[model samples]
Target: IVGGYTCGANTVPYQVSLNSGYHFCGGSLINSQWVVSAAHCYKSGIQVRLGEDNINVVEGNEQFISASKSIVHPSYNSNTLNNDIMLIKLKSAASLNSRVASISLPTSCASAGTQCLISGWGNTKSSGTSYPDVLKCLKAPILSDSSCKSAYPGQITSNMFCAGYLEGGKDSCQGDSGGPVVCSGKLQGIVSWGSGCAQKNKPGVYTKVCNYVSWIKQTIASN
Candidate 1:
């Protein structure tokens, strides 16, 4: 959440907080019972809170749902962070309202220099221990494949894409994983990995959401 600012109420309706006693990562509510998140955050005791703006206290509109199942991609590579996306099924359906809603999946791939928005409760600084209690959002411009590849060398794969600034003033850091990377009113990516938080020449890496459209639909329908 390096160049992110505080978010106001009802700004991002699809945003959700994944908690295990405390908020650990961010996610996107795709349907009343389905959430898309980074595979790394799929853990036991994890719960989802939708329509929530703050994590430090309870909200009247917040709907807490227990995770019934977590489906991670079969080809996911934890070491390289490839195929970092995961879908979580809630035990019960969530209530939809103006403050609580789902996001549409990407219908196409994101192009270079696309203006996208990312939201999370991650650390503002690389070494900071305390993270934000309120949701934080930043406007990140997607970088070209060639430019992104040059930034990370052989580590970047087709499954992953890059977003942020070349000078490195903004980025999604730790605790931001599983968060939504929204463009054109659709979820195009999820915060994946990077060298560090907003470091020079190291843009934030994201799981290309459009590439897994078939898999996501299949998972949700079959589940």
Candidate 2:
């Protein structure tokens, strides 16, 4: 599991391991050519591991890839956490394996109110504080633009998307930041920030892939 503090008030989740014993928030294969994750994770010395379960035990067929180039969104600001999205160019293409598959970027707007999947090695609850070596996933429903805007108030922007339980239970916490929020088998968003990881009034914000199609394509093309 990835190492970090949890977001909730209590209750911890299980921990896991990376094959090489390196910590990483999470990452997804974009295609044979590239992978996507948060810039902060890349900057933090996180290693990308494929085909592994327990971090402490190297049981599966694993491949470790060093990021050849990291393309952070030009407008990204760590202070405000804006434009937090980034892509990592692998030194070589990923091998075609059933356990590992590339996720597709959203080509059209994902309908609001749809359910999506978020996968990561982040803490389950806010205050629990445990990073699972094995990957875990949760289901979250997409929020309407107006609802998201109302929840975040002035912080909501066109480039951002929101999701989570309105009553506040499950959410993506610290170290979960760069993970994927997938819908209909396509990449729709990347976990960015939230009020405090599953707070009733706070929803998880993500980088809207639909709005950055050109930018993603251009970057991938150039690399």
What are the lDDT figures for the candidates, one per model? 0.90, 0.68
Candidate RMSDs in order: 1.0, 5.6
Candidate with maximal lDDT: 1
TM-score, per-candidate, Cα-based: 0.97, 0.86
Residue 202 in model 1: lDDT: 91
| Candidate 1 ranges beyond 4 A from true positions | none
Q: What 10-residue stretch in candidate 2 is worst by lDDT?
A: 9-18
Of candidate 1, the 10-residue stretch with the lowest lDDT total is 126-135
What lDDT score goes with residue 122 in model 1? 91
Best by TM-score: 1
Question: Which segments of model 2 are wrong by more than 4 Å?
Answer: 1-21, 44-46
* Candidate 2 lDDT by residue in tens digits, 130-219: 667556677888988988989988887787888877777777777677778888888888878888777786778887878777888999
Query: lDDT of model 2 at residue 123?
Result: 70
Error of 1 at 186 (Å): 0.6
